[PDB]
Amino acid sequence: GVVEELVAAIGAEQVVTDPAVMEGYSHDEAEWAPYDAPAAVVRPRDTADVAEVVRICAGRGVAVVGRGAGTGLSGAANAGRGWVVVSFERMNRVLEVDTVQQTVTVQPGVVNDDLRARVAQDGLWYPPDPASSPWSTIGGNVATNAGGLCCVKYGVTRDYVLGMEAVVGSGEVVRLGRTTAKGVTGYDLAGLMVGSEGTLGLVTEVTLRLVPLREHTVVGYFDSLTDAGRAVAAVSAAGIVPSALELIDRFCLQAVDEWKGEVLLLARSDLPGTSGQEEADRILECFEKEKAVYAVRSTDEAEALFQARRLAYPALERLGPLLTEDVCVPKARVPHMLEAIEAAGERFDTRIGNIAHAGDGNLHPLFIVPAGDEEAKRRAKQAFEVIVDEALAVGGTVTGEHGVGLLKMRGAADELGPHVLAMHRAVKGALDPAGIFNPGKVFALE
Amino acid sequence: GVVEELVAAIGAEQVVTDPAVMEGYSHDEAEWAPYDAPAAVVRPRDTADVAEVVRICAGRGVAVVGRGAGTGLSGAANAGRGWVVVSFERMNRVLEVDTVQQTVTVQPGVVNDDLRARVAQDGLWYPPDPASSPWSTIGGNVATNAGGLCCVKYGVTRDYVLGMEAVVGSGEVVRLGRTTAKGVTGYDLAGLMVGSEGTLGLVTEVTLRLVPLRRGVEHTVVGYFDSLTDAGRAVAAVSAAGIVPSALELIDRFCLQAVDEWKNMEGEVLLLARSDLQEEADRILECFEKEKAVYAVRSTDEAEALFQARRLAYPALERLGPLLTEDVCVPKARVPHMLEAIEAAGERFDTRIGNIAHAGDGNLHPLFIVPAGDEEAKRRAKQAFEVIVDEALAVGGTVTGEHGVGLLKMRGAADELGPHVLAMHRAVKGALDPAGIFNPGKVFALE
Ligand SMILES: Cc1cc2nc3c(=O)[nH]c(=O)nc-3n(C[C@H](O)[C@H](O)[C@H](O)COP(=O)(O)OP(=O)(O)OC[C@H]3O[C@@H](n4cnc5c(N)ncnc54)[C@H](O)[C@@H]3O)c2cc1C
Ligand SMILES: Cc1cc2nc3c(=O)[nH]c(=O)nc-3n(C[C@H](O)[C@H](O)[C@H](O)COP(=O)(O)OP(=O)(O)OC[C@H]3O[C@@H](n4cnc5c(N)ncnc54)[C@H](O)[C@@H]3O)c2cc1C
Ligand SMILES: [Fe+3]
Ligand SMILES: [Fe+3]
């Protein structure tokens, strides 16, 4: 009967309990991730309301799962029987853009693009652009440490989180991190909150640092995954850093070309003036010493090839359920990793489509399961399970940006090992003594 | 005995007990920071030996304080009576330079420059260049989260720690962080170890990210001023008028004519600037002639000696007596107000405080030199730097920007963090160090 206490705690129009308005709030876009009907879905208005839902929930042992827009692919925001889904959709204001400090102060509910458009008016820029930029929230991007296409040279969300206001413990509002451009005082707790996937506390206000408002595409029509890619084991080994570098295959494109060589490799270079034309002709030398049917300098605003890469996951989702994996391996092991994905596609008769942020060795293998073809659905799980077990042996990690959540919990336990898992339970026990903040995700308590 | 177990595990040429050969291992350069003779100073050879020192001391409640080169300015490496000083001076090798991944894998004892010179051979660059680059270690810079001079565009040491190998708890050797260029698996535990000042475990290996060695545009900008008050509106204007510089420092003549009594190589405020792009290179002048300036030459030649003077400013003064240094960092828009307040606090406590500052990001270094014979001047200066810390907190800054909390800034940091954050600090250290052996009583005070 936690709902009666919540409505007496934070009004009656903040707490929603209708089970029909909850099926959309109890899961993200991760399919086969066990979710259930929660007890209540709270829509807090300010930090005080979150400080009450955490306080009510800490005295009862009721689980609290934060939720932004529910666009995760690992089930990180999925609810359980009796949980409380704190929806930050009402805290969606940008509270400041310090133009001289080059920082912005945002609430966890502001959408990624809504933030980028706002800071653009003041000549500042927020680099991290995850392929879900028009939908994901800053509160979600901070807890998952989401990365984008420009992470090659600009970094992930952690590279811009300066400080934050969180609700931790039994409901204490604390200020974490610095607000300046330098500061070592204490521990790096504001950083520990990044990538924690909401299992240590709810962020109710985030800072973030900005950069001034910083164009050459590269293109390359190639064939197999064994080759083609190998220009990524060469661009990093030979030619500088491309402002972007993706790896999408024709298999995903002719599913975007229906919804309004063989495997391409786009690259970018954003340098003003003559410094900048050479990055676009420096990023070519790697592309023709490797088969190369076409490969044209290009750079003709076309750009149409990068919207296709962004709409790679917005496609193949209305064509059936989509299972996605997200491994990140060393850049020198991308050629074999593409070999293992295509070889795992025949060991389990499943034709795995490949998209990848090739600029840092982060691959997104993806297979589309026919809502009627069963065995390809069950070989793919085993096929996507050998991919993670292979990416771990080459020296990579089970996830590169999407987070652990639920679907990558086992494989992640193998990477961290028994000793690191012991520290995870110890850390969460200190900052979440009641065990209410998204329990059983990333690691399993017990 | 307690030394008997150290000698029984790996104690032949690793364990030293001579009290004369331990004072150089039991304290750093922080003046008036309580240090004392430890019980033993271990100089481990590999990660396994550290796992033995932690295992012995965890079962006995004996404190362990890590040591790199002992160049801290906050007493972060100071030992206590009966502690064990783990000296990483024997782990001073770079064990890898991944050229395709653009990473380096180094041991905690490697000197900061020793790392950059090594990676320079392969056309790669390690940006963070702290003013103690010829002496401090990478293991120390990771534990302190040290920053450099051209950091105002590339970031601090934390911005380059990818993964690490640490000895945590009762002695388990663990791998923290990734080695690739992406990875969110688990918590950012390797990051929690960065900037922890060795109070959660000893780092025995850190992986670091590198950047290509671009050259060409080393446009510098000099320009002596008249006062510290009017070298405000010109540091807050280089950012508001557009685009931050590759570097921007602010040193005064008292430190310059303290370097000139050595390598005999103008005004009262130098303020150097940099630009690595090229336009703008005449635009960072406009902040200097719109405000008062005795001089200002966009000089691209060598001009470059003045930066060795800025770097060697604390390597200077080091010969003029004991030096009390502070390290506050305030918002960039509040540097002008801070420089007025410190110089005004120099007469409210008539101690003439010399000023160096990373004015490009708001990190100020007020410093006073103690005559060492005037006793009250020890207490006149102490309170003068105390109102400076209390002013940086009320203005919206932090008690430390790069030097770390350590010992000398514990009272000020406790006021900034507050009771709730301090409670989380003890809870974390209690969880990862249940025995309380990893540098106890630093950064925060255990109840
Ligand atoms: C088409 C498409 C493309 C995508 N491309 C990318 C990509 O390139 N890179 C990438 O990283 N991701 C991508 N994503 C998914 C991405 O991981 C999520 O969108 C993002 O990580 C967070 O989104 P959210 O906030 O909407 O998620 P949610 O599922 O709502 O939750 C995010 C997590 O944070 C927690 N949480 C939310 N708010 C708070 C708070 N204040 N405090 C603490 N915890 C909180 C939740 O517990 C949850 O674990 C993509 C998704 C889609 C559909
Ligand atoms: C002239 C001068 C200029 C300086 N400039 C800067 C600057 O620009 N920026 C800046 O940040 N600092 C600067 N410093 C001080 C600087 O913090 C230290 O030089 C450096 O951060 C620590 O290096 P170290 O190994 O010498 O530290 P130590 O004196 O050994 O102590 C460092 C701290 O980290 C711990 N530690 C050491 N090794 C390890 C390990 N392997 N694992 C865990 N903990 C460990 C110690 O316990 C101690 O608490 C300067 C100092 C001087 C004298
Ligand atoms: Fe992605
Ligand atoms: Fe400094």
One DSSP character per residue, A304-327 reads HHHHHHHTTTTSSSSSS-EEE--E
Q: What angle do CA B291, B309, B381 make, to 5 degrees?
A: 80
Same domain, A355 and A228: yes
- Residue B134 resides in a domain: yes
Q: What angle do CA B59, B64, B68 make, to 5 degrees?
A: 150
Q: For residue B445, what are the CA distances in angstroms to B199, B295, B423, B426, B427? A: 11, 49, 10, 8, 12
- Residue B12 resides in a domain: yes
CATH number of the CATH domain containing A343: 3.40.462.10
Domain boundary among A72, A89, A106: A89
Other residues' Cβ atoms within 10 Å of the Cβ of residue A12: 11
Q: For residue B87, what are the CA distances in angstroms to B14, B68, B76, B318? A: 10, 6, 14, 24
- Residue A403 resides in a domain: no
Chain A partners within 8 Å of B100 (Cβ): 233, 236-237, 330-332
Same domain, A360 and A221: yes
Structure tokens at B332: 């960039």
Q: 3-class DSSP state for residue B408?
A: coil
Closest CA to B142 of B159, B154, B124: B159
- Tokens 């690595």, residue? B276
Most distant CA atoms of chain A, gap in Å = 70
The conformation of residue A93, written as its DSSP 8-state character, comes to -
Same domain, A262 and A347: yes
Closest CA to B438 of B154, B200, B181: B200
Cβ–Cβ below 8 Å for A184 and B421: no
Closest CA to A235 of B85, B117, B388, B102: B102
The conformation of residue A369, written as its DSSP 8-state character, comes to P
Q: Which of A192, A398, A402 sits opposite B187 (nearest CB)?
A: A192
SS3 helix, strand, coil % of chain B, rounded to 5? Answer: 30, 20, 50
- Which residues make Cβ contacts (< 8 Å) with residue A393, sequence separation at least 6? none
**Rounded Cα gap, residues A300 and A306, in angstroms:** 13
Domain boundary among A212, A232, A256: A212
Same domain, B203 and B301: no
Total domains in chain A come to 3
Chain A partners within 8 Å of B277 (Cβ): 272, 275
Same domain, A385 and A325: yes
Through-space distance between the first and last CA atoms of chain B, rounded to whole angstroms: 28
CATH number of the CATH domain containing A26: 3.30.43.10
Structure tokens at A46: 């300010």
Cβ–Cβ below 8 Å for A186 and B443: yes
**Rounded Cα gap, residues A86 and A15, in angstroms:** 9
CB crowding B108-124: b at 16 or more within 10 Å, else e: bbbbbbbbbebbeeeeb
**Rounded Cα gap, residues A207 and A96, in angstroms:** 9
Same domain, B203 and B335: no
CA distance B19 to chain A (A): 32
Q: How many CA atoms lie within 13 A of B4 on its CB side?
A: 2
Question: Which residues in chain A have their C atom more than 2.5 Å from the N of the next written residue, marking a break after them?
Answer: 214, 260, 301
Gyration radius of chain A's alpha carbons: 22
Relative to beta strand B84-87, strand B64-67 is parallel
- Residue B299 resides in a domain: yes
Same domain, B282 and B361: yes
Q: What angle do CA B96, B94, B170 make, to 5 degrees?
A: 100
- Experimental technique, in short, is X-ray
CB crowding A198-232: b at 16 or more within 10 Å, else e: bbbbbbbbbbbbbbeeeebbbbbbbebbebbbbbb
Closest CA to A268 of A293, A305, A233, A234: A305
- B147 at A interface, C-beta within 8 A: yes
Closest CA to B397 of B366, B352, B353, B427: B366
- Residue A222 resides in a domain: yes
Question: Does residue A83 contact residue A119 with C-beta atoms inside 8 Å?
Answer: no
Total number of residues shown for chain A:
446
CATH number of the CATH domain containing A163: 3.30.465.10
Same domain, A287 and A239: yes
- Which residues make Cβ contacts (< 8 Å) with residue B427, sequence separation at least 6? A430, A431
Ligand nearest to the CA of B26: 2
**Rounded Cα gap, residues B103 and A372, in angstroms:** 47
Q: Which helix (H) or strand (E) holds A415?
A: helix A409-431
**Rounded Cα gap, residues B432 and B429, in angstroms:** 5
- Which residues make Cβ contacts (< 8 Å) with residue B364, sequence separation at least 6? B326, B327, B328, B329, B330, B335, B338, B339, B342, B355, B356, B357, B358
- Residue A401 resides in a domain: no
Helices (H), A209-349: 232-235, 250-256, 274-282, 285-288, 304-310, 334-347
Ligand 3 mean position, distance from CA A401 (Å): 7
Cβ–Cβ below 8 Å for A427 and B189: yes
Same domain, A222 and A317: yes
**Rounded Cα gap, residues A32 and A159, in angstroms:** 32
Q: Ligand 2: which of B87, B136, B402, B437 to mutate, most ligand atoms within 8 Å of CB? A: B136
**Rounded Cα gap, residues A166 and B444, in angstroms:** 21
- Residue B444 resides in a domain: no
Same domain, B64 and B131: no
Domain boundary among B367, B395, B423: B395
- A271 at B interface, C-beta within 8 A: no
**Rounded Cα gap, residues B93 and A48, in angstroms:** 52
Specified resolution (Å):
2.8
Q: Which domain holds residue B6?
A: 2-89
- B405 at A interface, C-beta within 8 A: yes
**Rounded Cα gap, residues B189 and B187, in angstroms:** 5
Same domain, B232 and B363: yes
Question: Does residue A67 contact residue A56 with C-beta atoms inside 8 Å?
Answer: no
The answer to whether the Cα torsion of A149, A154, A156, A162 is positive or negative is negative
Question: Does residue B272 contact residue B359 with C-beta atoms inside 8 Å?
Answer: no
Question: Does residue B53 contact residue B64 with C-beta atoms inside 8 Å?
Answer: yes
- Residue B319 resides in a domain: yes
Q: Which of A159, A236, A427 sits opposite B100 (nearest CB)?
A: A236
Q: Which helix (H) or strand (E) holds B356?
A: strand B354-358
Closest CA to B311 of B365, B275, B351, B268: B365
Same domain, B296 and B278: yes
Would the CB of B165 count as within 6 Å of ligand 2? no
